[PDB]
Amino acid sequence: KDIEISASESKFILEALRQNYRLDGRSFDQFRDVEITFGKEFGDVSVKMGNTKVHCRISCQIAQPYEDRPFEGLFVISTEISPMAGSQFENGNITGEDEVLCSRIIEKSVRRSGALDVEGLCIVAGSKCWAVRADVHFLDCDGGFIDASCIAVMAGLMHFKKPDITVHGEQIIVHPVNEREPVPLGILHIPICVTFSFFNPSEISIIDATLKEELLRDGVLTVTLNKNREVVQVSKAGGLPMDALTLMKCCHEAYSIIEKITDQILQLLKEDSEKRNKYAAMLTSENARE
Amino acid sequence: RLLGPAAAKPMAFSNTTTHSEQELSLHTGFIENCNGSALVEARSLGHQTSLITAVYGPRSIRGSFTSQGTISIQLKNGLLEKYNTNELKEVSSFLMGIFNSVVNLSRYPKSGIDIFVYLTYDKDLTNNPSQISSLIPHCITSITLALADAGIELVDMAGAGEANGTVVSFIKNGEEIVGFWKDDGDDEDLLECLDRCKEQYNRYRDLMISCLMNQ
Amino acid sequence: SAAIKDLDDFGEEELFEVTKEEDIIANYASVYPVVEVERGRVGACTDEE
Amino acid sequence: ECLPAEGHDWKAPTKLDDPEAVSKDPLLTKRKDLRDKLICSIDPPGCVDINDALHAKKLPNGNWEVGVHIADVTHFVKPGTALDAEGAARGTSVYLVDKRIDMLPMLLGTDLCSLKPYVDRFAFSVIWELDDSANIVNVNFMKSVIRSREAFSYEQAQLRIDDKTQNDELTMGMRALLKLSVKLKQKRLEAGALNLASPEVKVHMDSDPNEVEIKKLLATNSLVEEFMLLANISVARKIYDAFPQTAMLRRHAAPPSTNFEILNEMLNTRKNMSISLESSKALADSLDRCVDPEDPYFNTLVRIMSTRCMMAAQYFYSGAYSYPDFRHYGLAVDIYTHFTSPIRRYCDVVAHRQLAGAIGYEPLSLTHRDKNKMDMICRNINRKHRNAQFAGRASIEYYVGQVMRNNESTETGYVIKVFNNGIVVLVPKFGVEGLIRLDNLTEDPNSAAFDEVEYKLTFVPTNSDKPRDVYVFDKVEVQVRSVMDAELLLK
Amino acid sequence: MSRLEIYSPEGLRLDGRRWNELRRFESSINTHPHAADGSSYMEQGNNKIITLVKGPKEPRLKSQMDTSKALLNVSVNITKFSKFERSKSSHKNERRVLEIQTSLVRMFEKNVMLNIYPRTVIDIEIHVLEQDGGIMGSLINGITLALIDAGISMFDYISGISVGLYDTTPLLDTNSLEENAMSTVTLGVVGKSEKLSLLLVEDKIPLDRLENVLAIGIAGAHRVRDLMDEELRKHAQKR
Amino acid sequence: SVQAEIGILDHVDGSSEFVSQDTKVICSVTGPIEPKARQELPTQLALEIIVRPAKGVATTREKVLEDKLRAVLTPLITRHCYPRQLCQITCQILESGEDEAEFSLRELSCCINAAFLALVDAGIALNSMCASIPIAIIKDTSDIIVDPTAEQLKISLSVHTLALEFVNGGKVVKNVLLLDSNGDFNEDQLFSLLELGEQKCQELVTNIRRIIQDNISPRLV
RNA sequence: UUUAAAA
RNA sequence: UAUUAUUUAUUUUAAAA
């Protein structure tokens, strides 16, 4: 019930790496071309980078805040993997290493690192708050699971819109989405994950390994940056021991990637906003005088 | 759906709004899924008890090489007077220590016997405010009935009785004790506890053979 | 009471009445049943239950 | 889906008897073709939302055919639709300095409902017949089609009226409106009407703000004002005659003596003057006799300070008050309403629908006959009215604050209230109030003294050794400094 | 406690230490001789950790047998009384434990010569009795010392240290109060080398500030290796 | 009109994507593959049906959705020519296209059409063809409508899911695979929509046959 | 709880 | 009967002639 790699295939891919050759034709520091597609409802995002395809789905509901932080909203994320992305995955295996690590990294990047404005999700302190949920669906597994999932969640949160709320003394009314247009969430910074795969025949490091390269891997490193030159999160455990010089090279190379991907999400959101707001030029209330 | 809305609270009834003989009824053989069935009901004073016991065995365990059999007893809540799951499993381990001394285990190699007791209704009609001690004797009599109906060999009958939280299970017409259970109660009292339970044991020892010889 | 009537505003209330779509089954509730088919097994809820 | 499908291509039919036109709009038959009237518009320069338009023609019997024409907004904003609900919630249009919040989409306010010149436009006309004394002989209300000949500004209208080389029919019509407005205002001031001043200034933009400009008045400003007042009075009487239980009207309560109590104590024990409180005419005539020989602006200062003592005007429906309570203290009129601005105010939208029910153009909506719904509407538009005034006064006060730090200068002003540890100065150059705390006013606030009876505060000025006494109503000179690590001082 | 000074101009922290001073490090070996093959009672500051190594032994079921190396299983048990407030078990709190356990397995499976012990399993049972910041680094030190007690062959030491960055001042061995007020980096340094086997950054840190934090992190971790090494010298010479 | 694609996923034997109104369902099929010990059938093929919701985790709602989707595909597959083998059919609901708390017929209908197309792309032996449509009747004017919108469901008296089996060029209705009805209706309304549905499914397979032929024909020679 | 007019 | 065995293989000494 697992993937079988022949000895010749393992030797060919590794020797190709020793000759600066990747089967797909990318460089060692080249990220796969990401493609963001937005659905009908808000918070519906499908990410395609190479043969890897992931689909995200944002939702929210009124919930009880944590008693330790009565002024913050909750953030939930589930990254279960179905046999759809490959028969090597068992359906119902929620506690798998890939599922746990993917959830924890996006959770640290979004919730813990302040990417999502949880204080803006506060309705009534200590009682009512927004619980923004992010569902991730692994459609086709060709490596880069957490890299694609982090782009899907961050694109979904910036594309998602929550119902409106009016403060009337001690009363609070939630407008239906059919009456008033929903309000977008608060997104401070945009964290993007970049995973590095290491090999040894003098070590070789490739960015965003495919499924075949991921299986012949000797060590994995995940970094998360934003356009503000901040290191949102780093996860490296085991594998080939590395030093501070190799990491900083990974972070500087990843910053060149996350900066371009950030500008793409901002541009692709702007294009999607205009597509669904054709007659928005007539409905403007706040207008300039003369 | 299930569970329902989390914001809902269960109903609360206030106590300030408006205001010898232990009956027994026995039946056996009525569940087609299992081998031996049983249904015991008892209503004394303001406390009515009705529970159902089913025996699924003997089941041949694949790859097992045990010399004797293994008994598995499991208590399960019903619909009224729900007890905590920890105390239910405590009575289960106490019951398994009883029937492992009664059921002929050597007559079932490489196999196991699974017991299922359902406390379907444990009514209590006290006027104004462990309660599980009043059901242990009724559960022992129910398992022995379903074990006998399932064609399982039982070395002598097994019954018990309550004496203010003191539950004692006897065998060989009270000659030897097979189980001891006592919650709350008082001190020094012991001779009267073993006496009140022994006469209650003989009351159940022959009443079980009554319905087992008829039908 | 999360109704817009409590806002005491005629404009918002009229906008709510126009944009509100009919939801016939929204006026009805249901029971939350718990099925327990005893088949001599242990574990979580069966697909039948 | 509530706006017309034609959009900018919407045009008024050329033939009101056209079968295709009346098939889509059956109410077109009850419309008076007035496109032969030489109607003009007078609005501030660079105006895109034209609510009113006037015309004047001399009848053969010596009288004049004066008629104001108001945008037929209720022809597009129908009740029970989301367009009505959106306008009712906004209540009015808020006019800030840089931005402006509209009550209705720009498709209506800027193009279709606005009385644009050279284009046929629907309107709600109010035709009068005045004599040489500006007395109404008969009033008639009708929905009409008009074509504005010109759209002058206030400065452009003042030029053509004072121009001597133009004597066409439209120009002569603008001469009559000027001679009839001064006669209407004459009898209004004799009836007891007030004459208050308001610090209304507007700043110019390209940074962005550079300087503040006080707006000067013209004789054409009062020309349109008297006929807008006359239009609202006539419609108020008409809509109350048809629906005495739910008529959308506006009232103004009489000011209690408590409001003018503190103001008279200041003028008596510092200027030796007072304000009469017997009647509205006694109050207006007392302000005219309340003037300082050295400060010509001091007379306008008392008129401004007395405006804050005035009661707040109120929208209401006629079924909740007896007729004597309909009185409007400020205008000294028996009954008044708002009608000549349905693009801005929502109160006028309800007046148009009620006026259309009195004429028989279309039946009045049942929501405008409900006392419960009308009571809620009146409370909302009252709240949205003060909020729109507080928003404008704050936008003018903030954007002028950027002119204080980005343009250091010295400006003259008058003090309006003295405190134990501060003075409030009013500047006519900017029309805003300024608080000068005692800590920022002297080097030693512990040696100061406050006299409550004479309304003075004695302190040792900064960079000065001689104490200065600052009474109320003093023509002081203030400066502007930037101490941040905006502020006004006292020269 | 209350509103405190994190790093005073006098170079003193809220608990009295300085920027490069570690908490008290009291380690112990062979604390459970009749219950495991390797024992280490780690007491780093207020952190109290019991690490038990059971192996290499035959697997209970052949479903977890490798014919070329041993299997490494790390079980981290965080007691209900490890903090002040007795924490109740949360469904979300179970995910953070699995991430720590997996990070520990992947860390020591590369340093422990599993090839020498084929067809065997090595169970690592950990009990955290009290935590006060820097718990991830202290878990590493307990595993390293417990594996050595069990005679398990390794390539070198694995030292765990936690570094915090406050404004522009890095701080060594962060406690619970300091972690609540700054970003924290945990490191897994291999022996006296400058090589990292673990690097967890769970809070935002500027990129230009990360280079220096790692240098001071691997340096202070060498000091942790000395404290662990000396404890093994004293325990071997006295026995 | 409906949209559908084939062979979209790489690491599975057969995939598809079915779209109707706003309901989008991506389905994948992998088989025959090695079954688990608790799955193998001695004589025929075993099926693993999995449907996952667009939001939240898989609840008991999708469990009855699996059981209905299973009852449709099981007679539609020649299970006996794959003894001791497994087929994994996984449906992923991208957008529900309906109120999930109230209705689930628009998702069941799309999962049937997506699973059938994915089974065609995979190469599983199918006994015939299949089509599925949702049906509803409006409260005020008791009118039968095929493929109702989300707003029409909230104004309907009863909802219906009709799944038919087509043979011989898509003209002969061999059997009625699934007819799931909930709401208020009598015997006259049943055969009225059943007759109406048989001709709307008949033009669906005619359009489905065109969809799959436009994709499989360029593959073959 | 700032009168009136045009914005 | 370890030069023996495990079949969807728990074998962990298959080397010499």
Curated annotation (Swiss-Prot), chain B:
Please give the GO cellular component terms listed in this UniProt entry: cytoplasmic exosome (RNase complex); exosome (RNase complex); nuclear exosome (RNase complex); nucleolus; nucleus
Task: Please provide the record's keywords in A-Z order.
Answer: Cytoplasm, Exosome, Nucleus, RNA-binding, rRNA processing
User: Does the UniProt entry include the keyword NAD?
Assistant: no
Instruction: List the molecular function annotations (GO) for this entry.
Output: RNA binding
Highest taxon, organism lineage:
Eukaryota
Q: Which Gene3D superfamilies match?
A: GHMP Kinase, N-terminal domain
Biological process, per Gene Ontology: exonucleolytic trimming to generate mature 3'-end of 5.8S rRNA from tricistronic rRNA transcript (SSU-rRNA, 5.8S rRNA, LSU-rRNA); nuclear mRNA surveillance; nuclear polyadenylation-dependent CUT catabolic process; nuclear polyadenylation-dependent rRNA catabolic process; poly(A)-dependent snoRNA 3'-end processing; RNA catabolic process; RNA processing; rRNA catabolic process
For this protein, the record's Pfam families field holds: RNase_PH
Query: Can you state the subunit structure given in the record?
Result: Component of the RNA exosome complex. Specifically part of the catalytically inactive RNA exosome core complex (Exo-9) may associate with the catalytic subunits RRP6 and DIS3 in cytoplasmic- and nuclear-specific RNA exosome complex forms. Exo-9 is formed by a hexameric base ring of RNase PH domain-containing subunits and a cap ring consisting of CSL4, RRP4 and RRP40.
Q: What else is known?
A: Present with 7380 molecules/cell in log phase SD medium.
Q: Which family does the record assign?
A: Belongs to the RNase PH family.
Protein name, UniProt field: Exosome complex component MTR3
What organism does the UniProt record list as the source? Saccharomyces cerevisiae (strain ATCC 204508 / S288c) (Baker's yeast)
User: What gene name is listed for this protein?
Assistant: MTR3
Curated annotation (Swiss-Prot), chain C:
Superkingdom: Eukaryota
Location within or outside the cell: Cytoplasm; Nucleus, Nucleolus
Q: How does it assemble?
A: Component of the RNA exosome complex. Specifically part of the catalytically inactive RNA exosome core complex (Exo-9) which may associate with the catalytic subunits RRP6 and DIS3 in cytoplasmic- and nuclear-specific RNA exosome complex forms. Exo-9 is formed by a hexameric base ring of RNase PH domain-containing subunits and a cap ring consisting of CSL4, RRP4 and RRP40. Interacts with NIP7 and NOP8. Interacts strongly with RRP46.
Similarity annotation: Belongs to the RNase PH family.
Leftover remarks: Present with 3180 molecules/cell in log phase SD medium.
Main role? Non-catalytic component of the RNA exosome complex which has 3'->5' exoribonuclease activity and participates in a multitude of cellular RNA processing and degradation events. In the nucleus, the RNA exosome complex is involved in proper maturation of stable RNA species such as rRNA, snRNA and snoRNA, in the elimination of RNA processing by-products and non-coding 'pervasive' transcripts, such as antisense RNA species and cryptic unstable transcripts (CUTs), and of mRNAs with processing defects, thereby limiting or excluding their export to the cytoplasm.
* Name this polypeptide is given: Exosome complex component RRP43
Give the species this sequence originates from.
Saccharomyces cerevisiae (strain ATCC 204508 / S288c) (Baker's yeast)
Q: Which residues of the full protein are shown?
A: 100 to 148 of 394
Curated annotation (Swiss-Prot), chain E:
Query: Per the record's keyword annotation, is RNA-binding included, yes or no?
Result: yes
Record's keyword annotation contains Repressor: no
Q: Name one GO molecular function term.
A: RNA binding
One Pfam family recorded for the sequence: RNase_PH_C
Task: Locate the coiled-coil region(s) and give their ranges.
Answer: none
Q: Which GO terms describe its cellular component?
A: cytoplasmic exosome (RNase complex); exosome (RNase complex); nuclear exosome (RNase complex); nucleolus; nucleus
Q: What is its main location?
A: cytoplasm
Q: Which InterPro entries match?
A: ExoRNase_PH_dom1, ExoRNase_PH_dom2, ExoRNase_PH_dom2_sf, PNPase/RNase_PH_dom_sf, Ribosomal_Su5_D2-typ_SF, RNase_PH
Fetch the Gene3D superfamilies from UniProt. GHMP Kinase, N-terminal domain
Q: Which UniProt keywords apply?
A: Cytoplasm, Exosome, Nucleus, RNA-binding, rRNA processing
* GO biological process: one example: RNA catabolic process
Location relative to the cell: Cytoplasm; Nucleus, Nucleolus
What quaternary arrangement does the UniProt entry report?
Answer: Component of the RNA exosome complex. Specifically part of the catalytically inactive RNA exosome core complex (Exo-9) which may associate with the catalytic subunits RRP6 and DIS3 in cytoplasmic- and nuclear-specific RNA exosome complex forms. Exo-9 is formed by a hexameric base ring of RNase PH domain-containing subunits and a cap ring consisting of CSL4, RRP4 and RRP40.
The miscellaneous remark of the record is:
Present with 5150 molecules/cell in log phase SD medium.
Which family does the similarity line name?
A: Belongs to the RNase PH family.
Name the record gives this protein: Exosome complex component SKI6
The organism of origin for this protein: Saccharomyces cerevisiae (strain ATCC 204508 / S288c) (Baker's yeast)
UniProtKB/Swiss-Prot annotation, chain F:
Give the subcellular location. Cytoplasm; Nucleus, Nucleolus
Q: Which SUPFAM superfamilies match?
A: Ribonuclease PH domain 2-like, Ribosomal protein S5 domain 2-like
Matching InterPro entries, A to Z? Answer: ExoRNase_PH_dom1, ExoRNase_PH_dom2, ExoRNase_PH_dom2_sf, PNPase/RNase_PH_dom_sf, Ribosomal_Su5_D2-typ_SF, RNase_PH
Tell me the Gene Ontology biological-process terms attached to this UniProt entry.
exonucleolytic trimming to generate mature 3'-end of 5.8S rRNA from tricistronic rRNA transcript (SSU-rRNA, 5.8S rRNA, LSU-rRNA); nuclear mRNA surveillance; nuclear polyadenylation-dependent mRNA catabolic process; nuclear polyadenylation-dependent rRNA catabolic process; poly(A)-dependent snoRNA 3'-end processing; RNA catabolic process; RNA processing; rRNA catabolic process
Instruction: Keywords in alphabetical order, please.
Output: Cytoplasm, Exosome, Nucleus, RNA-binding, rRNA processing
Record's GO cellular component terms: cytoplasmic exosome (RNase complex); exosome (RNase complex); nuclear exosome (RNase complex); nucleolus; nucleus
Molecular function GO labels: RNA binding
Q: What is its main location?
A: cytoplasm
Q: Which family does it belong to?
A: Belongs to the RNase PH family.
Q: How does it assemble?
A: Component of the RNA exosome complex. Specifically part of the catalytically inactive RNA exosome core complex (Exo-9) which may associate with the catalytic subunits RRP6 and DIS3 in cytoplasmic- and nuclear-specific RNA exosome complex forms. Exo-9 is formed by a hexameric base ring of RNase PH domain-containing subunits and a cap ring consisting of CSL4, RRP4 and RRP40.
Q: What else is known?
A: Present with 10800 molecules/cell in log phase SD medium.
Please state the gene responsible for encoding this protein. RRP46
